[PDB]
């Protein structure tokens, strides 16, 4: 009945757009879909009994141009171990550091990881750490559709093997990874265009077996409200 | 004989890629070629008598969601007047502010306008001001091919209608425009791949009357050195 509830139906998989940057330069981008989430790894493998879709960050390559810098990037990648795990449990996203690279995270802008208020936290090594909750996001998305709130942020940025670049240019960090659950991008874009008319717009949730939905703003906000009443709040 | 010298030959037109961001969101991109350069403008009417190709930044749109914020974008755009002019003469890029929006600029990275050290300057209104010199760029590029220095920067970022976001998230700025002379982007990528081997790689200089070139690193570096020797310092 409510198409947005498919976001949370057990067995469905979200698409995650994973984009990696070495020293401010995009070097990798893949979309990933896996019930056990994903693991950012640096090709040491080394275990094949870990859950999660292994996302292998590319070698920095060999060039006579930035040899010294790429050497550091390579070292970081060589210390990823089991990697950075990111996975979903219902309305919650979880991250865990399985290797030896300390990793810090924030939910931030699409284009800018460090908004200036520091990281949201450090990814823990021996337990799951919560990095996203769809509950508040949807509450904030509804506020946005009502004009009385900015659009909620949904871009997960990870800084791997270095401190968070607070008050520093993020392009100096060796290994920055952005992870966008693309359903959230689509939800935000749908609200933005939905505010401009009472006509139908198309939103694609980018989850398993998804198809584009055609909704007016009224129908969309009704569904957001129905969705939010079905989610958990502490 | 030196293909790169085509960059500076009389009558040459460079391509410039203009990308605009409203509050950290890309809203517009257009590539221009014009001997008189370009002008970043707000409306598609009012001033149709000035030299330089008009690049009209899009209306923010009228949504119930962020109209308070976009209202500010809209007012900024409406104050652009004759616009922000950008053009080339020889090995130099020049800019001039023809309307009412104070505009700060810096040469920086493709993805990050404000690396923290502040703006290179404010674009002057009553006189043109130099915003880029290909001479030092090519010196720095050669240093890069020799692994003795970082990749030279070539992205011109303009903050329109507000102070430069020094130690501030650039995405909070209402109107940020990136201009890339795409030849410079191509020259850097060529050096980048050229360092990986001595195989030939292709470069499109994205300039008038220039077909793609296929050079080894050795040839490219030879051409860069010949180029810089004929440039003004």
């Amino acid at each position: 009945e409510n198409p947005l509830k498919r976001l949370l139906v057990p067995g469905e998989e979200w698409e995650f757009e994973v984009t990696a940057f070495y020293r401010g330069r995009q070097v990798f981008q893949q979309t990933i879909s896996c019930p056990e989430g994903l693991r950012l790894v640096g090709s040491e493998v080394g275990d094949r009994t870990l859950p999660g879709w292994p996302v292998t960050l590319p070698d920095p390559g060999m060039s006579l141009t930035d040899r010294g810098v790429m050497s550091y990037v390579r070292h970081v990648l060589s210390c990823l171990g089991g990697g950075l795990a990111l996975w979903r449990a219902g309305q919650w996203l979880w991250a865990q550091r399985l290797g030896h690279c300390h990793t810090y995270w924030a939910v931030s802008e699409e284009l800018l990881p460090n908004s200036g208020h520091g990281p949201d936290g450090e990814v823990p090594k021996d337990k799951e750490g919560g990095v996203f909750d769809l509950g508040p996001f949807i509450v904030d998305l509804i506020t946005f559709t009502e004009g009385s709130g900015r659009s909620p942020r949904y871009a997960l940025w990870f800084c791997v093997g270095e401190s968070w670049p607070q008050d520093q240019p993020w392009t100096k960090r060796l290994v920055m990874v952005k992870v966008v659950p693309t359903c959230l991008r689509a939800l935000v874009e749908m609200a933005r265009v939905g505010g401009a008319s009472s006509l139908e717009n198309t939103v694609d949730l980018h989850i398993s077996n998804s198809h584009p939905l055609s909704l007016t703003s009224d129908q969309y906000k009704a569904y957001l409200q129905d969705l939010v009443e079905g989610m958990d709040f502490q | 004989e030196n293909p790169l010298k085509r960059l500076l030959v009389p009558g040459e037109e460079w391509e410039f890629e203009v990308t605009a961001f409203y509050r950290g969101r890309q809203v517009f991109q257009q590539t221009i070629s014009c001997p008189e350069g370009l002008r970043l403008v707000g409306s598609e009417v009012g001033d149709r008598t000035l030299p330089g190709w008009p690049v009209t930044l899009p209306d923010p749109g009228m949504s119930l969601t962020d109209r308070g914020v976009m209202s500010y974008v809209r007012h900024v755009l409406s104050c652009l007047g004759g616009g922000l002019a950008l053009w080339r003469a020889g090995q130099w890029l020049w800019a001039q502010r023809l309307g009412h929006c104070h505009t700060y600029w810096a040469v920086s990275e493709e993805l990050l306008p404000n690396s923290g050290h502040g703006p290179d300057g404010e674009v002057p209104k009553d006189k043109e001001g130099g915003v880029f010199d290909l001479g030092p760029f090519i010196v720095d590029l050669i240093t890069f091919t020799e692994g003795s220095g970082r990749s030279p920067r070539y992205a011109l970022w303009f903050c329109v209608g507000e102070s430069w976001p020094q130690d501030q998230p650039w995405t909070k700025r209402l109107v940020m425009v990136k201009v890339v002379p795409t030849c410079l982007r191509a020259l850097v990528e060529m050096a980048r791949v050229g360092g990986a081997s001595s195989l030939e790689n292709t470069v499109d200089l994205h300039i008038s009357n220039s077909h793609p070139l296929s050079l080894t690193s050795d040839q490219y570096k030879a051409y860069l050195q010949d180029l810089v020797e004929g440039m003004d310092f």
Partner: peptide, 4 residues
């Protein structure tokens, strides 16, 4: 209006 929310400027955050």
């Amino acid at each position: 209006t929310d400027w955050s």
